[PDB]
Amino acid sequence: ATAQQASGVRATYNYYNPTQNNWDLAGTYCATWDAGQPLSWRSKYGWTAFCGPAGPTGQAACGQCLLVTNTATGASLTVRIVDQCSNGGLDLDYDTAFKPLDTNGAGIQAGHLTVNYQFVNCGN
């Protein structure tokens, strides 16, 4: 079957700042399973927390990849799930995911983006 997807969910941002910290997963929920991965894996894609209404979540979602589309502009980006959030959307790392998706700057004025997402092959 097709990989899971949802449309029109909210994406906020969080300052994980993996590039200021050697892409270290310590402190994220997924560190339990994924912190030992090589730098090439940890830094392949920008980071997000995930809690969408379609697809695996929590432990089963750790390390999976999402193609995220900003519905206000058409920008898209692949991100890696490194954490879980407590709503029904995404909490994108600001530096490595929210900022590159916010191509007209409206997202930081509103405090969020409206995005679609689909699970995709990470190509690891």
**Calpha distance 71→83 (Å, rounded):** 23
Helices (H) and strands (E) in the chain, counts: 4, 6
Strands 76-84 and 46-50, by their bridges, are: parallel
Resolution of the experimental model in angstroms, please? 1.5
Strands 5-14 and 113-120, by their bridges, are: antiparallel
Q: How was this structure determined?
A: X-ray
Residue 114, CB-side half-sphere exposure with 13 Å CA sphere: 5
Domain boundaries, the chain: 1-124
Burial code of 13-40, b = ≥16 C-beta within 10 A, e = fewer?
bbebebeeeebebeebbbeeebeebeee
Structure-token match 């790392």, residue found: 93
